[PDB]
């Protein structure tokens, strides 16, 4: 191979490189990473480094869906946050396709060399059992997977290999996010899979892939705010409704609870049944018609971050909202339960996060910042055990037992 | 000797220059002692004489060895260390003896002469300049610089460990079956090999280290059990922590204290209750390593209790990959938890205590959850796998917890062990309003300017109350108002509040709290039979919520 020019990459002004500690790994994952890194070292992709490199970035191993091969995953979230901005408009048509297949073209990045002055920032460590040896330290020589600079730098090369396919299929939308390739079409499912097979064979031919996962955005349903339907309303039931309507008035307009609060007169017992007046039945009825559809006039700001909140509704059900400003939801949803995680909350939560992020990628071309309803220590202990994506979104941990729980289900 | 290993490039912190600390005057005895020491490590190539062009300097002292007439060359690199780049600590912890697989043949080699065998980056050497002063202040002092990793310099541990690892690397490839543990002075070599065939491999390794400038004295060479290794005594069937003896000195110096703290920090990983807070407070405000430090009342008492703790014998067995890992937890007082990790009954690998003193309100269930996680994480570090757990909590107790808990939680494979005190939900709020039970409409308010406030209730049975409160807040009065309702009521109650704060901390169902207020509320909830707590949006015309809010504000 002949040396091709690396593009100059710098950190943001005033920012130093990533200094994140490596978390413990099991014996199975360590051995897997060792074998992978030995191969990459032989192929010149990574090089061993010493302690004079003060930077470090977590590494671990995952297994993609519909695959049994171990996949090396590096958490470049800290590096990405500090890496300069590289200046593709997001395909709005991708959301309106009947079928969007996800292809992994991450191996393509290992063809392009990385700027020598930047390689130090890609340092990572393979831990050893019982610290028998000090961890094996590596840095990258080529474009790393998970780094936001990789798809940007490799963009020009990606457009050339897709140019023949995009002309032969002008009604097929192809979008790239990190290591994954999103291919959408309104074509019939049988003929669709033969087209993505035609594409992945075109990618295998030129070494973009090294020797399934289908999405259906039309089936992504919105979860609206629903009001209970009863013939007998207790004082407690009225109070619950008032509390839910009061909160919902922060999102929707024209919501009033005057006629419902009149029913709560004097000092009533909670279990007392109170007959709804004809004007209370009216006020309730017109509130329902307001909460029927999503709120108009909520626009997506491409510059501002996306935020995702998740609630645990029990029985394997989870609700979620995506917004950029409070009470201005861009999307709301609810996920049904799935067999395999009948007793595992963490597994259900991890899958939910990946689903939401996936939808956010398809719709806006960006993963949201998650507010996870889980203790930090509990999440950080087992979340890798159920992760199947090559990207990792930002997240924080919230601990507020909400009334917002039944305010969405 | 000096290793032919490639030097590791070292830089100063950006924008910083080398040290320029003036050398303190010394006794003629100490000066002549330093001259004899420097002369030896000059002809051994460890240091070299420098010219007057070098502007940098680092203070040196002359202390005598513990119970010896020999002098030591001590260097205070604190100034150089501040100006030296950061290095990455690659290790994730200390190797645990219970992480060792049982071996038929064991050898522990002494690589103590290791710091002064690893070459220092030639570009950085000038910053390690020091001066042997003259008594007359007229004759110029003898100035040297280090060619080798200096004892006490910031980068010495990391660069050495890196150098050693790279040197041990080819020997480990040629011998994938042989287990090697390195940690400064001690070098562990184990194998399931016959003695003669094993001792031959030992000589092969020593010759390998010798060619790379690392000597292994046959005096400190250990042949027969037990083998001393990292403060542990390795027997063929068991391991024992060797008795840790703490110094007894009339006058403690700064150097003595920090060495003591470092030692106690290491022991704290094995023994529970080791404290160094009062000793660390002594160090703040010191300028020199030789500065004498008087032990305070809290400090000498802290040191005394540490001595008693280190008297307890600690021992365990080795690891066997063929058998599963078992971890058992039991509840103790003051939210303390003890655990044992074993494979065969009453043959512990690791024994420790977990004191959970982080947080205001919690329950035994959450504390057990966090304990399991800590243990699981440790096991992965040492053995690379998570153990099967034996927990003092009913399978029904846990199922009632995670299904009703708003937050996501989970516990790995575990079986129930019936040994008190068991972990139990001491109470549980109702999901639906209680019929026939009195309904308390509860509210409280407080003046932010005077910290004065009221708290009370109004019931559907016509009962009302309001109590004056002093030195409280808006949040405290909301909890006191709920506390009132619990006090003046039967075993079944409905309580309506507008406080999101008060509601939130009771939803978590804690059984212990730092607050005397919350603790009493907890005690009330336990004695109750049924309690339903409802929330209502404040100031919207809700009946009972109206009358009680006006009475408190």
Author numbering:
A (entry chain B): 2 to 88, 94 to 217, 231 to 428
B (entry chain A): 1 to 553
What does the article say, verbatim?
Certain nucleotide reverse transcriptase (RT) inhibitors (NRTIs) such as tenofovir and lamivudine can inhibit both HBV Pol and Human immunodeficiency virus 1 (HIV-1) RT, leading to speculation on structural and mechanistic analogies between the deoxynucleotide triphosphate (dNTP)-binding sites of these enzymes. The Q151M mutation in HIV-1 RT, located at the dNTP-binding site, confers resistance to various NRTIs, while maintaining sensitivity to tenofovir and lamivudine. The residue corresponding to Gln151 is strictly conserved as a methionine in HBV Pol. Therefore, the structure of the dNTP-binding pocket of the HIV-1 RT Q151M mutant may reflect that of HBV Pol.
Here, the crystal structure of HIV-1 RT Q151M, determined at 2.6 Å resolution, in a new crystal form with space group P321 is presented. HIV-1 RT Q151M was crystallized in the trigonal space group P321, with one p66/p51 heterodimer in the asymmetric unit. Although the structure of HIV-1 RT Q151M superimposes well onto that of HIV-1 RT in a closed conformation, a slight movement of the β-strands (β2–β3) that partially create the dNTP-binding pocket was observed. This movement might be caused by the introduction of the bulky thioether group of Met151. Gln151 in motif B interacts directly with the 3′-OH of the incoming dNTP and the conserved Arg72 via hydrogen bonds. The structural analysis in this study also showed clear electron density for the Met151 residue, which indicated that the side chain of Met151 is flipped out from the dNTP-binding pocket and is exposed to the solvent. The structure also highlighted the possibility that the hydrogen-bonding network among amino acids and NRTIs is rearranged by the Q151M mutation, leading to a difference in the affinity of NRTIs for HIV-1 RT and HBV Pol. The structural comparison also suggests that hydrophobic interactions between the methyl group of TNV and the thioether group of methionine might compensate for the loss of hydrogen bonds; hence, tenofovir exhibits an inhibitory action towards both HIV-1 RT Q151M and HBV Pol.
